Amino acid sequence: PVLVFKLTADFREDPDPRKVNLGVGAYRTDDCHPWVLPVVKKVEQKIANDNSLNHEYLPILGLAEFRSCASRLALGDDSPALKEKRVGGVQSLGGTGALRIGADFLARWYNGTNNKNTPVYVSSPTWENHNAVFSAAGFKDIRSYRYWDAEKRGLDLQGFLNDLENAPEFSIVVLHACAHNPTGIDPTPEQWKQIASVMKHRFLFPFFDSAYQGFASGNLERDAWAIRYFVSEGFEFFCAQSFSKNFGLYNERVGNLTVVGKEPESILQVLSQMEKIVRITWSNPPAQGARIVASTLSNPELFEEWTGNVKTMADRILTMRSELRARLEALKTPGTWNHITDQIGMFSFTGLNPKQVEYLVNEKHIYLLPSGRINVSGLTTKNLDYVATSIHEAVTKIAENLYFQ
Ligand SMILES: Cc1ncc(COP(=O)(O)O)c(C=O)c1O
């Protein structure tokens, strides 16, 4: 599960001046540089001048203000679950750490004691590290639900539902909260209702993965609709949150595992068990990233500025999608390209085949995944024409099948 990071390493070492990194989902400005969000520079300065801050261990489960703030962002300020004190939060090492802690919990305490046979269902296709994290937790039966229909380039809703109907009771279902990685296609709210209905009837466990809240619609509230719907339907569930993308805090490793239970006693028990799992993994979590997020989200002014920074990223992505589609169309590139602008989040699942990716990587020094996934936030007004013309070359020169064409 380390392909994107190897892609980045190959890109850095490449001497060719034309090179473009469209692999890893990391935001870039229109001049192709990292963007430290304005709200983050401001809160960092406030931390650097605040002499009451010490370096003593945080609690095992982490910084209380951060955990509350994060769960609130997922669930909404007026969530009934918050009001009924049936919500817990475990500060984690980014989204990955939240998924891993959640996985280790389920493998020890869920559906019996030390049950490694509980099926875990992930999307077809999904993030590379999903299978790897759940296998590391010791789960033996990892399965796929139909998701991507490559013919219609949207959701195979009937397949998805049918796979969930046939899942053994109590199976764990890893659901992308919004901004599906890699397809950029999410269920509509009406589709989510049908999914939830099947999960409720078959007692399936929702394990949400929320790594991109803000990037699907530009609006934090709207991107959490599905999480909030599952709360309202009476589910207990996990939701692994990352702030790597929406705060641009990749290298400070800031995540939160939100837990929604039936009652406060449920949460107290789950959390006391999570303490043991954290202790034998990283002991307790790092402070800097969590303090930046806690400060931002607990202050109405910084919060508003932050949501404006997220909107800025989401809007730049929209523009890059429109521009790429337009240039491919003006070049008369074969096939249709509306899927570039239909898809949402950070990525486009372009539909290019593995030989077309190989051409782009080795001949044109444009780095993307063998699947055809690109990071749309890697495109810029300066690289767009090179990327479009290169895709055109690949699509016209490299056939799907060498013979019979
Ligand atoms: C779907 C998905 N889940 C989890 C993660 C893990 O993020 P992190 O770097 O915060 O550990 C990513 C990457 O942002 C992701 O795309």
Active-site residue among 245, 306, 337, 364? Answer: 245
Residues whose CB falls within 8 Å of the CB of residue 13, separated by 6 or more in sequence, listed in order: none
Q: Which atom of ligand 1 is nearest to the CA of 242?
A: 10
Classify 54 as helix, strand or coil. coil
What angle do the packed helices 300-330 and 288-297 form, to 10 degrees? 100
Q: Are 227 and 177 in contact (CB under 8 A)?
A: yes
* Domain residue limits, the chain: 2-35+315-397, 36-314
Classify 175 as helix, strand or coil. strand
The residue whose CB lies within 8 Å of the most ligand 1 atoms, and thus the one to mutate among 122, 181, 256, 347, is 181
Q: Are 330 and 339 in contact (CB under 8 A)?
A: no
Cα-Cα-Cα-Cα torsion 32, 34, 40, 44, nearest 10 degrees, comes to -140
Question: What is the distance between the alpha carbons of residues 50 and 58, in angstroms, rounded to a whole number?
Answer: 17
Nearest CA to ligand 1 atom 13: 211
Q: Are 65 and 332 in contact (CB under 8 A)?
A: no
Q: Which atom of ligand 1 is nearest to the CA of 130?
A: 3
Look at residues 332, 321, 393, 333 and name the one whose alpha carbon lies nearest to residue 360. 393
Which protein residues touch ligand 1 with a CB less than 6 Å away? 25, 94-96, 127, 176, 181, 209, 211, 242, 244-245, 255
Question: What is the distance between the alpha carbons of residues 101 and 154, in angstroms, rounded to a whole number?
Answer: 32
Q: Which atom of ligand 1 is nearest to the CA of 127?
A: 1
Name the DSSP letter for residue 381.
Answer: T
Classify 228 as helix, strand or coil. helix
Q: Please state whether 110 falls in left (phi above 0), alpha (psi between -120 and 50) or beta.
A: beta
Residues whose CB falls within 8 Å of the CB of residue 334, separated by 6 or more in sequence, listed in order: 395, 396
Distances from the Cα of 330 to the Cα of 22, 42, 213, 337, 357, angstroms: 22, 43, 33, 11, 21
Q: Are 377 and 313 in contact (CB under 8 A)?
A: yes
The C-alpha R_g of the chain, in whole angstroms, comes to 21
Write down the experimental method used for this entry. Answer: X-ray
Active-site residue among 35, 104, 127, 163? Answer: 127
Residues whose CB falls within 8 Å of the CB of residue 203, separated by 6 or more in sequence, listed in order: 169, 170
Question: What is the distance between the alpha carbons of residues 160 and 8, in angstroms, rounded to a whole number?
Answer: 33
Q: Please state whether 290 falls in left (phi above 0), alpha (psi between -120 and 50) or beta.
A: alpha
CA distance between the termini of the chain:
35
Q: Which atom of ligand 1 is nearest to the CA of 180?
A: 1
CA of 293 to the centre of ligand 1 (A): 17
Between CA 387 and CA 391, with CA 389 as vertex, the angle to 5 degrees is 65
Question: What is the distance between the alpha carbons of residues 175 and 43, in angstroms, rounded to a whole number?
Answer: 32
Residue 141 carries which side chain, given as an amino acid letter? D
What angle do the packed helices 64-75 and 225-232 form, to 10 degrees? 90
CA of 210 to the centre of ligand 1 (A): 8
108: Cα separation from own chain's centroid: 25
Name the DSSP letter for residue 57.
Answer: P
The residue whose CB lies within 8 Å of the most ligand 1 atoms, and thus the one to mutate among 129, 254, 346, 349, is 129
Residues whose CB falls within 8 Å of the CB of residue 368, separated by 6 or more in sequence, listed in order: 7, 22, 23, 350, 352, 357, 360, 361, 374, 375
Name the DSSP letter for residue 250.
Answer: G
Residues whose CB falls within 8 Å of the CB of residue 405, separated by 6 or more in sequence, listed in order: 399
Residue 187 carries which side chain, given as an amino acid letter? P
Residue 124 carries which side chain, given as an amino acid letter? S
The DSSP annotation for 88-132 comes to EEEEEEHHHHHHHHHHHHHHHHSSSSS---S-EEEEES--HHHHH
**Residue 192 tokens, joined:** 């989510």
CA of 242 to the centre of ligand 1 (A): 6
Classify 47 as helix, strand or coil. helix
Helix (H) or strand (E) holding 256: strand 254-260
Is residue 245 annotated as a catalytic residue, yes or no? yes
Helix locations, 152-217, DSSP H: 157-165, 189-202
CA of 23 to the centre of ligand 1 (A): 14
Question: What is the distance between the alpha carbons of residues 6 and 11, in angstroms, rounded to a whole number?
Answer: 9
Question: What is the distance between the alpha carbons of residues 126 and 201, in angstroms, rounded to a whole number?
Answer: 25
User: What sign for the dihedral angle of Cα 188, 194, 196, 199?
Assistant: negative
Say how many residues make up the chain.
Answer: 405
Count Cβ atoms below 10 Å from residue 53 Cβ, excluding itself: 12
**Residue 193 tokens, joined:** 């209702």
The DSSP annotation for 327-378 comes to HHHHTT-SS--THHHH--SSEEE----HHHHHHHHHHH-EE--TT-EEEGGG
Q: Are 351 and 153 in contact (CB under 8 A)?
A: yes
Question: What is the distance between the alpha carbons of residues 119 and 204, in angstroms, rounded to a whole number?
Answer: 10
Q: Are 80 and 98 in contact (CB under 8 A)?
A: no
Is the CATH code 3.40.640.10 the one for domain 36-314? Answer: yes
CA of 256 to the centre of ligand 1 (A): 12
Specify the resolution in Å: 2.0
Q: Which atom of ligand 1 is nearest to the CA of 254?
A: 10
Distances from the Cα of 366 to the Cα of 10, 150, 374, 397, angstroms: 11, 23, 10, 17
Look at residues 220, 299, 306, 346 and name the one whose alpha carbon lies nearest to residue 41. 306
Beta bridge partners of 175: 208
Q: Are 244 and 24 in contact (CB under 8 A)?
A: no
Beta bridge partners of 256: 91, 241
- β-strand pairing of 154-155 with 148-149: antiparallel
Question: What is the distance between the alpha carbons of residues 167 and 229, in angstroms, rounded to a whole number?
Answer: 22
Helix (H) or strand (E) holding 229: helix 225-232
Question: What is the distance between the alpha carbons of residues 295 and 30, in angstroms, rounded to a whole number?
Answer: 28
Active-site residue among 35, 209, 225, 306? Answer: 209
The residue whose CB lies within 8 Å of the most ligand 1 atoms, and thus the one to mutate among 7, 96, 246, is 96
Q: Are 90 and 271 in contact (CB under 8 A)?
A: yes
Look at residues 106, 129, 297, 103 and name the one whose alpha carbon lies nearest to residue 213. 297
Residues annotated in a binding site for L-aspartate: 25, 127, 181, 373
Residues whose CB falls within 8 Å of the CB of residue 18, separated by 6 or more in sequence, listed in order: 364, 365, 386
Residue in the structure block whose two tokens are 């939701």? 239
- CATH entry, 2-35+315-397, from 2.70.150.10, 3.90.1150.10, 1.20.1090.10, 3.30.70.260: 3.90.1150.10
Count Cβ atoms below 10 Å from residue 291 Cβ, excluding itself: 22
Residue in the structure block whose two tokens are 């895709």? 391
CA of 102 to the centre of ligand 1 (A): 14
